[PDB]
Structure formats: C-alpha cells, structure tokens
Design an enzyme around this catalytic site. Structure first.
Site, PDB file in Angstrom:
ATOM      1  N   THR D  58       1.746 -11.496   2.435  1.00 10.72           N
ATOM      2  CA  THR D  58       1.091 -10.890   3.580  1.00 10.72           C
ATOM      3  C   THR D  58       0.084  -9.825   3.136  1.00 10.72           C
ATOM      4  O   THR D  58      -0.851  -9.494   3.868  1.00 10.72           O
ATOM      5  CB  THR D  58       2.145 -10.284   4.525  1.00 10.72           C
ATOM      6  OG1 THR D  58       3.107 -11.293   4.862  1.00 10.72           O
ATOM      7  CG2 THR D  58       1.502  -9.787   5.801  1.00 10.72           C
ATOM      8  N   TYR D 146      12.001 -14.035  -4.989  1.00  4.35           N
ATOM      9  CA  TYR D 146      11.427 -14.481  -3.727  1.00  4.35           C
ATOM     10  C   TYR D 146      11.482 -16.008  -3.701  1.00  4.35           C
ATOM     11  O   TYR D 146      10.678 -16.683  -4.343  1.00  4.35           O
ATOM     12  CB  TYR D 146       9.989 -13.956  -3.610  1.00  4.35           C
ATOM     13  CG  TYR D 146       9.297 -14.221  -2.289  1.00  4.35           C
ATOM     14  CD1 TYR D 146      10.000 -14.692  -1.187  1.00  4.35           C
ATOM     15  CD2 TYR D 146       7.938 -13.973  -2.144  1.00  4.35           C
ATOM     16  CE1 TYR D 146       9.367 -14.899   0.024  1.00  4.35           C
ATOM     17  CE2 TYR D 146       7.298 -14.180  -0.942  1.00  4.35           C
ATOM     18  CZ  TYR D 146       8.012 -14.640   0.140  1.00  4.35           C
ATOM     19  OH  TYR D 146       7.376 -14.811   1.350  1.00  4.35           O
ATOM     20  N   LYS D 174      14.690 -12.193  -1.687  1.00  5.74           N
ATOM     21  CA  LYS D 174      14.039 -12.389  -0.407  1.00  5.74           C
ATOM     22  C   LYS D 174      14.146 -13.883  -0.131  1.00  5.74           C
ATOM     23  O   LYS D 174      13.617 -14.716  -0.904  1.00  5.74           O
ATOM     24  CB  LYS D 174      12.583 -11.872  -0.451  1.00  5.74           C
ATOM     25  CG  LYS D 174      11.795 -12.054   0.873  1.00  5.74           C
ATOM     26  CD  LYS D 174      10.358 -11.529   0.763  1.00  5.74           C
ATOM     27  CE  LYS D 174       9.627 -11.729   2.101  1.00  5.74           C
ATOM     28  NZ  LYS D 174       8.193 -11.709   1.778  1.00  5.74           N
ATOM     29  N   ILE D 214      12.504  -8.190   5.145  1.00  5.30           N
ATOM     30  CA  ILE D 214      11.190  -7.938   4.591  1.00  5.30           C
ATOM     31  C   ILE D 214      10.360  -8.847   5.504  1.00  5.30           C
ATOM     32  O   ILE D 214      10.056 -10.002   5.179  1.00  5.30           O
ATOM     33  CB  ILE D 214      11.119  -8.373   3.122  1.00  5.30           C
ATOM     34  CG1 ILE D 214      12.131  -7.557   2.312  1.00  5.30           C
ATOM     35  CG2 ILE D 214       9.712  -8.152   2.583  1.00  5.30           C
ATOM     36  CD1 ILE D 214      12.278  -7.994   0.867  1.00  5.30           C
TER      37      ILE D 214
END
Lengths: 302, 302, 302, 302
Positions: D58, D146, D174, D214
C-alpha cells in the site's frame, strides 16, 4: 517468389519463430559471465533457434542490474546479431524504470521488446493501458506483450488486449496464460502475432494460428523445438505430436524445478556450465539432479 | 488397401470421429418427444456426424427417467443405427444404478458407454477404480470415461487413468478437463482413444493425437465440425483453424447459456423445435436469444 | 425473562444450534440399518447435539433410495423428535424429484428442509430462483439453502441469495462456500440464519454472526462442538479457539478421507459400528485407519 | 499487575496491535511528500493506530526508490516514533537487495521488518528458507513474514513456515493467504504472532488467536478498526461483528479499486490530500469516485 507453409508468419520479421528466453550465465561467485553468454547464444542459434529473449524471466531479470542486462544484450548482439532476432525484456512493475529499460535496449539495437504485465502491485486494466502506452511511445522498437497472470497476479484482459493492439509498435503477445477460448478470437481480431509462452502448448498455439515459441526447455532441446516448428510448417503433424510428446519429461522437470533452475541445470548436464542462479532462486539438489537426468534421457537429450 | 490420414484412428470403430452429446427433445409440456429425437438424430448424421451420445449431460440425464433414456436410445438406434455409433451415458454417482443403466444400454445394442466421473459426492481415486471397475465388469460394451472435474467436483487423476486403461473394455476418454500436460503423455502411454469434450479444444486435441469430438455446438454447426475434422485429417491446417475460429461465437454463447439451453435454443432458431429444458435448466430469455442470434449469424449458421 | 448471549439466535427454533449431517448406517451387506440409525441419533443428541440433518451429503443421499430416506427420517423422529430439530435433505438436481422429496419430508414431520444447490448440470441463477421457488411453494416447512460450489459446480450468487430470502419459507443457509466477504453483508441484509457448513469455519461463522453449525466431525466429537458453541455464547473466546484448534486433526482427516468415510470410520473406532459406505464411496484402508486413529487421539476423542 | 483480555498478545511489543500499511504521499508531480507523510502518520496514530508499516504494498514499494523509503521511515519515526511501532517493508524478489533494505531499515531504528514472499520469479520453498534465512541473519530486528500468494505467485507452505519459525528473529506473519485450516494449527505450533493481512478477515483472525491487524481500509476508518480490536478484547463480540459488517463497503471498494488507489482516494475525500499513485497504479476516475463516496458514507466514514 513465395512458398506459404501452414504456420502463420505474422511478426516473425521482428521476433523470429523458434527461440528461448535465454539464461544469464553467472560465474561460480555469482558474477555475470559475458563470455558464457555469447557461447550459449551462438550454441543455441547454431542448433536452430532464430530468436533470443534476453533479460526475460528465465534470464533472471529480478536479480540482475540494469547494467548487467545492457551488457549481455550488447554482447549477444555482437555474437549472433547477424542471424537471430534479439528481444529485450524491459518491463517491470514501475512505469518509469520500464521506460528507462526500453530506451536503453532500443539504443543497443534490440529487434524487439518483451514487456511483461506489471507484477505484484496488481494495477487496473486502465493502469495497463497507461503503462504499456507510455512504454510504446518511448521508442520505435516492436513490442511483444507478455501475458502471464500466474507470475504477475493479473492478466491482460481481452478488451484491454484489443485496445493495445491499436498502438503502432505493439505487434505481438507471448502467451503464458493459456486461455485458448479468448486467444482463438484475439489472434484473428487484433492482428497481433501470438507466441507460445508455455512449452506444453507450443504445438497447440501453432494449430490455433501462432507464429512460434519463446521456450524454456529449448535450452536443452533446441534442435527438437526447431523440428517441431518445421514439422507443423510442412504439414507433418504426426511428426509434430511425436516430438511434442517426446519432450514431455522436460516439461515435468520444469514443473518441479522452475524454468531458471532447470535451464541452467540442464545445460550443465550437457557439458555447458552457465553457473547457478541467484537467490532466492536455487539450483537443484542431488536428488533433484537425478530425477532431471532421468527426464533428460527420456526426452532423448542426454 | 489403407490410406493413413493425420488423425489418430484409435477406437473410432466404437465411438466414431465427429459426434455430439445429443439433446433429448421435449414437447411443450415437458414430456419426452421420441419423434423429434429420431428427427434430430437423422438430421445431424445426414449433416456429417457419425456418432451420438444419448443421455449425456447435454441430453439432460439428470431430469430424465431410466425408461425415457432407454426409450430414446432404442428409438435413435432404429433411426440411425446403420450409419452412426450410438454411445449411451450410463454413469451416475451411485455404483448400483450406474451398473443398472449400463446393462440396460448393452441389451439395447449400444456401441459404447459414456461413464462420467461420479459427481457431487467426491469419492477417492480408490473409489473410482472400484466404481468404474464394477461397471466395466457388468457388460462387454466399450467404455469411454468422461473426465470433467468442473461438473463432478473431482478429476480422474493420471495414475488412476493408467490403472483403468488396463481393463479390457475401457477404451476411451471424453476429456473436458483440459490438462494438456498430463494428457499429452497419457494418450501415448495408455493407448486410450482421447475425445475432445470441450468445443474450444476440438482442434487442439486432434493436434495432440485425439481421435475426434463429442461436441455441444455441433448441434448448430454439424457440417462445419465434420469439416474441421476432415481438414485436419487431410493436412489443410489453415482451413482447420479458420473453421475453429469461425465457430468461436457459439463457444461464447455456450459459455453464457450452458450446453443444454444453447443446443435447444439454437436448433429452434434454425427451424428445428426440440422444446425447452426441464428445471432447473432454463431456456434463454428474450435478451439472451437476441445475443444468441448474433453469435449464430457471426458463426455463419443462421 | 430473556438472557441474550453473544450468538445470533436467528432461526434456531427451526434448525437448532449444534448439529451434524448424520450418517445413514448400513449393515454388513449394504442394507439400511434403522436400529443403528436411531441408536446414533440418540447417542449424538445425548452428547449435546440439538439438530440432525438426515439424508444430507454425509448421510449418503446419492446412494440411498427415496424410501430409505423417509424410513430413516420417521425412525429418528420417533427416537429423538422430542428433543432435537430434524432437518431433511431433499434437494437434487431435478426440480420434480426435489419437490417430491420435500413433500414426503413435510408429511413425515420434518422441522426443516436442506436444499442443496443443484449439482452437476450447472443451471443459471435464474434457474436457481425457479428451482428453489418451486420447492419453497410446495410445503410450509422452513428451508435451509445449502451453498457449496465445491460439490455442485456452481454457487448461489449474492444477488440470487437476496431474491430467495424474500420467499417466506426460506430462512437459512448452510454455508460451505466460505466467501466471508459476501456473507458478512448478506447475514445483515437478508435476515437469513447462517450455519457453518465447514468444520474449520465453525468458530469463524459464529464471530461473523452465525447461528450454529451442521458439522461432520461432530460425529466424533459431539460434546466438544457443543462446548465450542457455549464457550462463544458465554464470551469465553480463549476456550473457543482452544477447542477449535484442538479438533483440527479431525479436519485434516476429513480432508484426506471425505466426510462419509471419516464419520463412519471414526464412529466404528469409538465402538459404534454403523457399517461402511456404498460405492463409489469407500471406507479407509488399513494405512488410512492408522493415520485416522492418530488424528483422533490427538483431537482427544480416542 | 496484569489484566488478560481475550486477544492473544504475542509479539505486540514489536509489531503493535492495530495498524495500517501506510500510503506514501506524493505531490502533484509525483515527488515524495515527506511532510504529508508525517501528517498522515500522526493523524492515524492519534486516531488509534499503534503500528505503521512503511514501504509496504500500500506504500507503493514498487515505484519508490530505496532512498525515498529510508527517507519516509526516518521522517515518520521522528513524528510518531515515541508512540507507535514502525515496521519497514524490506522484502523484494532479490535476496541481495532485500538484505540491503533490511540493514538500512535497522540502522534507521525500525521496530520490525515486513518481508514479503519473493514475487514473480516463483522460487522453491528451499529457496524461501535460504532467502528469509539470509535476511534474518543480517540484522537483529524482529521480522514479520508476509504470506500473500495472490500477489507473489507462491505461498509460504506450512512446513516451510514451521522451519522459519525456528530462526530467532522471525516472530510474526502478516497473513493475506486466508488458509484458515493450516493457520489454525500453525498459530498454536510455531508460536508466531499472526496478523490479519486482509481486512475482511480482521475479526476472523482475532477469533482464531490473532494478535491484530495491518490494514488497508484503516486509512479511512482508523478509530473503527481500533474499536473492532478493543471490542473483541473486552468480550463485546456483538459490537465487534457490527463494526466489521459496518465497514464492509470499504472492503468492496478496495476490491474494485485496489489498496493503493482506495487508500489515497479515500483520504483525499476526507480532506487529507496525499496525492495520486505512480504508474502503473492509477487514481479512481469520476465514476469510481462516486461509487467510493457511496461506500464511504455507508461505512459511516464520510
């Protein structure tokens, strides 16, 4: 004087017919090995390839610098430029750097440009038109779109493909998506030259009107791939499917190892050492190398 | 006396070369219409089809009784038995009823049997060997396995396919899975005749060594499909891909409407009323019929 | 007098809170065993279940006759009717027979009806509205839609679900689709009671506003499942996730064996013989039974 | 003194509880806007966020230079370092540059490191162990893996995750994969702190033992997200699912627009201009902005 074969000839004057996304040889310590790169290129072309994609996925574009890329490109051009189409992978997931890479490749004398669909970030199709648009406007070099949602995360949708085919320099698609339904019509509509971007569909794409392939296993069976093409071209379909089926084990190995590890491991096994890949990519371990030798012997290339 | 073409001839003496999973005509009130069934079969065969699957998916096997099936079968046999291979769909997701259906079809004089992979319940591959095993042991009629995970929920894995190819009556596969990697090798290994079970891959399967097709759109373009086959057979590949691409709109329509609705709606539009499907399957609405006419005119069959 | 817990209470007066899609016991020779069916039902309810789905997927609806179904239903009702909600699986992929099954179940005194999305034939969403519509109009019994594209081939799309929620007798959904994005909103919009149709999401669905579960592993850990529910209900979330994680091995086994084989094999291992499944479904072999014992001991139920 | 809530507290001393993968503000001409970056960070934290991932997906990590990243990091640290955990995205698909980015972030004072699974090249799991291994050995900063096959092309398999949990600095995941079956067990086995990497599963992960989120939509509803967390923490589950469902429209918008475009477009609509994204990412057009306003008003954040 003209002798029409069974294969579509669209765009072969820019991207050739039978080629591979060439590996980028590295020395034992991970440094680029320009000499081995020129050696491999001459080797492959002498074997029958008439096209080479430099800095493609198989060429380890993620772990090489922009300078290493330009370097390999200029080196291979000096080696096999007079008898093979050289296609430069310049697409990234950053429009600015994609533009930079395309200009550098143009000045280097690239015959074509491979521009993969932006990976990881998953832009919208509108973003794709703006991305590819900017790149196509930066140089006059023919562009081959690279559709492969399996690596990038998103596909180049049909409508998007139709819009892009309107740009004067967009002339081909490396297809690693395999959507035969959509492509069957796009090939006829867009006028774009379609290239097989997945070895198990090489013969399949020719039957649907494809112009050739940009292979991975071609590193290990270059002559065979050329024969697959010529066989179809001359109408010897039985021969074509026998060759295709014959090479299946290589496809299985690519499936277990990935294009990079396979291509570099297979060449080494044939007496052409081009080093190992750069992390996170890894060479096959002892057990994997055994399974690979098996597939290569079955494929008749070892 | 023998003239070998480019198409594999495996198992065509039991399942033919070019055929369709024929619709089961219904009267305005939902009753089976045997007369229209015989009319359609004679129509299709006269058009070039040399094979017909009765009680297949497109034949609405889920909403017809065992008696209606046997009835259509015996009726079509009387109509086109002397010039077309009649294949009976007998597979269900219950081994007992699958056996019952296969014996009834055998006694009826079926040339072959289509046995879909058990749907909905998702049995294990071991269950598949036991299921298909029991069916193949019940009669001497040649069996064509029907691989289509998209409808059943599970596929016939490669190893499972190899085991089944050992049974003396298992001689073919209708492939609606499209796993070209696995099938390319199975075709060569198992000796099984492979038939295209998905229209957009008809030409693709012939190139890989297929023996023919069991189509859906064939209801609307029977002569064209026959031509697709002959073209490939004679080596006229350019002609083959032109025909294939030409019929694309029908594929798109099948995609929007589903095989049953499309087949019945398309025939009606060509002046052959075979009724509507039985719920939950539905005929296309006014808007859909308009889009369908468009595709049919583009496909050159209206 | 009212004591609101943390769990949504929607539709529990028709479908209960904690239940299982009960197996259909068979004797050594494959015949239905009504006595064992009544035994298992009383066993499960005494263990904490307050709901039972008869003739569901796990109840082997594909290999049992309509009479066997009605028989089990009437038998279980006599056994545990005064203390458990009895839900009858009546959906098929034929609207006519689906209607027949629903009427028979209504007359038998079913508290609710489970109607799976038509499988294999893949009808359009319009077909679904007509299918479910006809069924809901045939009786006054509450209906629980069963969304599970993984078995049927198609899902009940969100818009379709919203239309169906308008029918007065459609009051719940067994969710085996797992589309948490769409369901989170539908639960709030449609007013439909949502039931977990996939054991690994039992706790997940309660957190999103679910009313309970229609489990598979519940056959082997009925008391635990009830505790999972009560824990959440009382706000003891730590306890809930400890129980959920504890039962994981059962989920893994279900994944390797399938709900039917697992449920019947697990009960036998606990001293409750309910026979083997009917082909094509199969009981676990010696090696699989060993792995299953392992998972059951880890799950703390053996 | 200790008051245990219902939420797992694992690793929150390094990665916080409620945070977002913060956008990287750009001026009208595409240049990084450090001032707006510090403004947004202070804004979000004051709103309830106690964690911020800088240079994440992002944060447009693909179109920003290494210097721009380090710059934003040092700037935000000066702004909200005394009251929020700062997590630096340092993973790329090149092990060497991933190492370079991680060392730069460590020296900058990062509280944690986010290391995405290498994208596009699709390395083997062995390659992942070598990749992550090298990174974890380069610094002493806690690492959060992630997992998001949807963007990278490959997942971090369960066995691979178990091996990696052995490295002393690998302390969290994540999760943007959503494999609830596998994760339910890994959370208990590996001792790794699991963070929701997909907004529609924020509440779902807390129920399964997650430590926080998150988020993406957190940019538009920071206070709400904090409330979602606290509600669960305090046992007010009804409140938690009401908030979760309430924010659904934002999830739908993220689905149509993508995290970057949505986050930047939503902030602007709330009076906080952070510019537009860099190509190939694009801001929403006029029609999309209208649909977005609708979703934001429904979500109660406009």
């Amino acid at each position: 004087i003209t002798s029409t074969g069974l294969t579509a000839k669209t765009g072969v004057e820019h991207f050739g017919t039978v080629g591979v996304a060439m590996v980028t040889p590295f020395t034992e310590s991970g440094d680029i090995d320009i000499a081995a790169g020129r050696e491999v290129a001459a080797y492959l072309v002498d074997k029958g390839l008439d096209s080479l994609v430099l800095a493609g996925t198989t060429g380890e574009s993620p772990t090489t610098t922009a300078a290493e890329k330009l370097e390999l490109l200029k080196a291979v051009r000096e080696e096999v430029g007079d008898r093979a189409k050289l296609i430069a992978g310049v697409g990234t997931n950053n429009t600015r750097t994609s533009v930079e890479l395309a200009e550098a490749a143009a000045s280097a004398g690239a015959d074509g440009l491979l521009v993969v669909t932006p990976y990881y970030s998953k832009p919208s199709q509108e973003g794709l038109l703006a991305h590819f648009g900017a790149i196509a406007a930066a140089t006059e070099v023919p562009i081959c779109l690279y559709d492969i949602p399996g690596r990038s995360g998103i596909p180049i949708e049909s409508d998007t493909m139709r819009r892009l085919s309107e740009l004067p320099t967009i002339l081909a698609v490396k297809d690693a998506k395999g959507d035969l339904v959509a492509a069957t019509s796009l090939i006829k509509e867009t006028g774009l030259a379609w290239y097989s971007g997945d070895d198990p569909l090489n013969l399949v794409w020719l039957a649907l009107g494809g112009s050739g392939f940009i292979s991975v296993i071609g590193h290990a069976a270059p002559t065979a791939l050329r024969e697959l093409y010529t066989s179809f071209e001359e109408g010897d379909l039985v021969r074509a499917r026998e060759i295709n089926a014959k090479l299946s084990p290589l496809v299985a190995a690519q499936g277990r190892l990935g294009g990079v590890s396979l291509a570099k491991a297979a060449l080494r096994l044939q007496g052409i050492n081009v080093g190992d890949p750069r992390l996170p990519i890894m060479a096959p371990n002892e057990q994997e190398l055994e399974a690979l030798r098996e597939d290569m012997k079955k494929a008749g290339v070892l």
